[PDB]
């Protein structure tokens, strides 16, 4: 936890710079619990613009 | 709630392992014995009638225990081996002590005390085995006995095994016999009972087991009889079913 978890994760990401978003995966565990899958749609259908997506 | 071990009492007070040993009896092979003078018989159901066995044992439920006593059995199988070894050893020790065969009721009470020794103490599993008794003596003649996991023993003339045999006991009461000591009548009655109670269609003789005990001149021979007479007994009973459908 911390040399192969959050650090040393963005090495080539610094070089490549295409569609590097973050998902800490707490934002899918929602309030209206079926907003989880809706925000999965909101993750992908907002992501696939920068065409090779990360 | 008050489950944990065989001991101690429940708050009414009932018992836990006692009722559950009875419900361990109920899912086993079905046995019975019949009211007969000048002989006595046993009936037994073959568990695991699968085609790849050997049957070289001549006896899977009967155990010719002393000389003039055998016993059927029902329940957890390998506890019964533990019980039969000890029972043979008890009766043989009695014969060693007196040079007279064991008069069968103190034999039954000895085994009941053996079972009760695991009913009281803690923590041991009680013996989940009920089993029958046929035998002969100098004091009453032919006898029949029913061991129970509580240590209670009831001298019956027509006995009871578990959930498969309540309707059998109902047939034994509604078809109660008295006076007729003929072994063949009792065999036909047993054929009728096992025809109703077992779900074996047309009663295949490989799925049954019959052993008898007669008094021959001074010997009290035990006849674990062969298969051909069982076949013709089934044919006898099906001819009597043809007699029963003469009413149509």
């Amino acid at each position: 936890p911390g040399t192969g978890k959050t650090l040393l994760a963005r090495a080539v990401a610094s070089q490549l710079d295409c569609n590097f978003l973050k998902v800490v995966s707490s934002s899918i565990v929602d309030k209206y619990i079926g907003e989880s899958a809706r925000l999965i749609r909101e993750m992908f259908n907002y992501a696939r613009d920068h065409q090779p997506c990360i | 709630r008050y489950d944990s071990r065989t001991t101690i009492f429940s708050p009414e007070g009932r018992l836990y392992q006692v009722e559950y040993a009875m419900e361990a009896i109920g899912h086993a092979g079905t046995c019975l014995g019949i009211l007969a003078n000048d002989g006595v018989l046993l009936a037994a159901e073959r568990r695991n009638i699968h085609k790849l066995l050997d049957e070289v044992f001549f006896s899977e439920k009967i155990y010719k225990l002393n000389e003039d006593m055998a016993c059927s059995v029902a329940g957890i199988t390998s506890d019964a081996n533990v019980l039969t070894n000890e029972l043979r050893l008890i009766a043989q020790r009695y014969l060693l002590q007196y040079q007279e065969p064991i008069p069968c009721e103190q034999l039954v009470t000895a085994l009941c005390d053996i079972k009760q020794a695991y009913t009281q103490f803690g923590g041991k599993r009680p013996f989940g085995v009920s089993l029958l008794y046929i035998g002969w003596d100098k004091h009453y003649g032919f006898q029949l006995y029913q061991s129970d996991p509580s240590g209670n023993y009831g001298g019956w003339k027509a006995t009871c095994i578990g959930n498969n045999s309540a309707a059998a006991v109902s047939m034994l009461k509604q078809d109660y016999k008295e006076g007729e000591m003929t072994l063949k009548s009792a065999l036909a009655l047993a054929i009728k009972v096992l025809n109703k109670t077992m779900d074996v269609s047309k009663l295949s003789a490989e799925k049954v087991e019959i052993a008898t005990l007669t008094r021959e001149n001074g010997k009290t021979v035990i006849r674990v009889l062969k298969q051909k007479e069982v076949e013709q007994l089934i044919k006898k009973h099906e001819e009597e079913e043809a007699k029963a459908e003469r009413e149509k």
């Binding site: - | 361990a24 899912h27 086993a28 092979g29 568990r47 695991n48 699968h50 329940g75 957890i76 199988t77 390998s78 779900d199 269609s201």
Partner: protein, 278 residues
Amino acid sequence: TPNCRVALRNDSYTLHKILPNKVDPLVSLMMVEKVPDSTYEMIGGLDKQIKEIKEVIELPVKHPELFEALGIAQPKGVLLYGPPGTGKTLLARAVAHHTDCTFIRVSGSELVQKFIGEGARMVRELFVMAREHAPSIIFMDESEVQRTMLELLNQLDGFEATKNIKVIMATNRIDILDSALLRPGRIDRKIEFPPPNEEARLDILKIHSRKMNLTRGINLRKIAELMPGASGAEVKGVCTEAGMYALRERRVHVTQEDFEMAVAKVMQKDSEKNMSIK
């Protein structure tokens, strides 16, 4: 009335006319209109059960005089049970189209209570409408939650109203229930449901296979004696597999040999061994 919907004038806020029909979304729980078209005869031979149901439901509606000039109450609590549970639904639909009476199916489940909504969901306002549609029969599949059913027992038990408003609970496996339901002053006729005999399996066979074009030289009691205690579930299944045999042939003709394979088409296991022990 108290609790009465009305129409309001829209310039001085006075009444216009009464809006009747106090009924909440609960006819949407009734849901009985065109249940099926009438089907009494489609029961394989449980006629004692049907006669007891007739003389526990309709005979109180037909002749209440003959009860209370004879001076007895009319029985209202009907629990239906069987050890497999078969014919549990078809008998309900059968009774439902032959009474001309406000039948009601509450075969749902103990939903809402405090999950997305208020609660009070077994007969809470449903009994108000059992009054509002005074001849009525209530039917349920079914012990599950522990205060709502109790409230509604105490609405149904004796202290309710004018009777002939009966409840039919119909499920298998009695012993999974609470300690209040099985009061005999609360359930008055408990009828068993046996798996059928050879003649009744023959009858159910005739019922389903009558529309099935069976060729000739075809015996049916042999098929009935190929059934080692068939509950009635698989009795329908044998005929459907016979129809499937006719379907896989591009044929419309069914022999008895099709049933000879169709009985064989049903066997499952539960084989395993080194478990006899017992």
